[PDB]
Structure 1
Amino acid sequence: HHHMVDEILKLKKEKGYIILAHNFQIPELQDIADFVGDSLQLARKAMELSEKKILFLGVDFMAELVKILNPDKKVIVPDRSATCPMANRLTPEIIREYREKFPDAPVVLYVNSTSECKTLADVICTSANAVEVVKKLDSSVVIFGPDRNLGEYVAEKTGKKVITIPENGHCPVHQFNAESIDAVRKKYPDAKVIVHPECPKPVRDKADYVGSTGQMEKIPERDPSRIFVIGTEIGMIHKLKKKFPDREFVPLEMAVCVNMKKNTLENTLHALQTESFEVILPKEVIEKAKKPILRMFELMG
């Protein structure tokens, strides 16, 4: 199609779709979305909608999070293979193993986890609320996955013991070189460096701020600095530049989530033409995964 944007806007209105896009989507998809945000922002937005049809642009665990909290809505995705390789390395078998060895340690699962894994969790957390969630739990020991870096960050801030699963659990996208910060400090002496808690400890410790994408987009609301250096996936640069056109946003390095970039204008148009591919979870998976999500809301309420 020669005008994919205009046909997408035409079909979404005609067929009663709200388009939700994650911060890491390509700019062209962010720009056609009704809302752009982090996984829990989009799931909460979906809960407020009068509309019953959602075109979700992200990866499977996020689309499923929307479906779990919006079970009667039709949720479609343009690429059914779009997934989180980090989430996928944690298994039910590994959770059961660690529960057995540490039975008094609550299982805290990062939202970047499979819906099957969520059915086995005591509580879910986001990168924004993980410290507060783990601080508020009774236990001085927790089981945490699937990101070892976020787990270690949480242990640093809370002073609690955090038992990370799986072994070497990590996001390839956030493995920046610490030397990249050394290089921007010299190139932009007055720039503020913001990096994700999924970054390795040497990167986190050299940044001015550590936070989630949702936290990153609030830092220019209180920090009047002209230049920010951003240590997360490249999609956030577009999001920040749109929100704060008066500031400069510099990627710490080019970091692309290949799965996030599986969604294109062409397969997004195909999704609205065919109203596929529907996100379907067994009723029992929705019911079980909902328990640790409600527990998270209870702790943050």
Structure 2
Amino acid sequence: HHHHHMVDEILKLKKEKGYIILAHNFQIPELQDIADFVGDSLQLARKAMELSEKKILFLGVDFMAELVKILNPDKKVIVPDRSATCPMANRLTPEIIREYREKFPDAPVVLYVNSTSECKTLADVICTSANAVEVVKKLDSSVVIFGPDRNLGEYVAEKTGKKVITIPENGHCPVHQFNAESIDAVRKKYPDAKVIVHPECPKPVRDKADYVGSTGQMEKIPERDPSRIFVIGTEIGMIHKLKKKFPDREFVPLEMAVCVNMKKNTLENTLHALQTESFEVILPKEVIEKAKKPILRMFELMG
């Protein structure tokens, strides 16, 4: 195979330098295939609390890399492309959070993991799409401030029956903005398929699906549902992961959806990352000290 040169040197350097490679489900297939651990944000977070390796090569977006570093302040965490980021996460600011706390002083601030680390210092608790409902449901308040994703926050309100005040205005992920007409069409084409969509999808898409969950939840659905075909309403990288786990099922994208930021990581720049041991994820000590609190609380409110 024409990529063997890069694959081989990645595997040699990883072993030589004492790295573990962690990847998100939306990384390109070639990188998922060289990673030691591939999963969703919640799975990556739990892995980050548990791993023993002194050095971590993280393959995803910056807020995830930073969470891994917050949970491992004394380990070296590197990323191939320091600009890989989540634009949705980036629209929420400290300024907005403080405005809404004042406006709603007894509402806890619940931040989606897709948020800047500075913003996380201001949060009462963090959540991911897999545990957002459980986390908010276990809080002792009928109103919560939630951001940055309006769709997830609305989904939380539905499932919990609580009032969810979303910040900022119109926070959403462009990648998950499917039209519900694509489900209609796919029902005609594959009448016995099961439709699985992300909670970041708009309400009409969520409401027409058979299942709604994080990518980690998506991967467990075929363990209990015997359907021959699943239609997947998330970023394209998940198709590879699903097909690999369940080669006897068919996985069909709801629509082709690509996260440009998740695609910034390549075999070539991942090799360079191992060769140079760059770019290190560095945070102020204060940010780590402060952002760790709502991350650890997330885990307390699961069990």
TM-score (norm 1): 0.99
Per the TM alignment, residue 2 of structure 1 is displaced from its structure 2 partner at its CA by: 6.8
CA deviation after TM superposition for structure 1 residue 296, in Å: 1.2
* CA displacement, residues 72-98 of structure 1 (integer Å, 9 cap, x when unaligned): 110000000000000000000000000
How much has 1:42 moved relative to structure 2? 1.7
How far 1:50 moved relative to its partner? Answer: 2.1
Secondary structure in structure 2 of the residue aligned to 1:218: helix
Query: Displaced runs of 4+ in structure 1, greater than 6 A?
Result: none
Mapped to 1, the partners of 2:201 and 2:18 lie a distance apart of: 39
SS in structure 2 at match of 1:56: strand
Q: Which moved more, 1:154-163 or 1:37-46?
A: 37-46
**Over residues 193-239 of structure 1, what are the superposed CA-to-partner deviations in whole Å (9 max), with x where a residue is unaligned?**
00001000010011010111111001000000000000000010000
Structure 1 residue 168: Cα displacement: 0.3
Alpha-carbon separation, structure 2, partners of 1:61 and 1:10: 28
CA deviations over 1:130-187 (Å, ceiling 9, x no partner): 1111111111000000000000011111111000000000000000011110111011
- Which structure 1 segments of 5+ residues have no match? none
CA RMSD of aligned residues (A): 0.9
Conserved 8 A contact 2:31-2:266: yes
Q: Identity of counterpart residues, as a percentage? A: 100
Checking the alignment, whether the CA contact within 8 Å between 2:180 and 2:205 is kept in structure 1 is: yes
Q: Deviations over 1:229-280 (max 9, x none)?
A: 0000001000000010111000000000000000000000000000000000
Task: Compare 102-111 and 291-300 and name the one that shifted more.
Answer: 291-300
Aligned to 2:234: 232
Counterpart contact for 2:21–2:37, Cα < 8 Å:
yes
Does the CA contact (< 8 Å) of 2:42 and 2:130 recur in 1?
no
Higher alpha-carbon deviation: 169-178 or 291-300 = 291-300
More deviation, 128-137/27-36: 128-137
Query: Offset of 1:48 from its aligned partner?
Result: 2.2
Q: Secondary structure at the match of 2:97?
A: helix
| 3-state SS of 1:169 partner | coil
| Structure 1 residue 294: Cα displacement | 1.5
Is 1:13 aligned to residue 29 of structure 2?
A: no
TM-score, structure 2 normalization: 0.98
The change in CA–CA distance for 1:298 and 1:2 in structure 2 (over 3 A counts) is: closer
Q: Give, in whole Å, the separation in 2 of the partners of 1:97 and 1:255.
A: 34
Which sits farther off after the overlay, 35-44 or 270-279?
Answer: 35-44
Question: 267, 273, 286: which is aligned to 1:284?
Answer: 286
1:56 and 1:238 mapped to 2: Cα distance? 19
Task: Extract unaligned runs of 5+ from structure 2.
Answer: none
Deviations 1:30-60 (A, max 9, x none): 0000010112212322332221000100000
Quote the offset at 1:295 in angstroms: 1.4
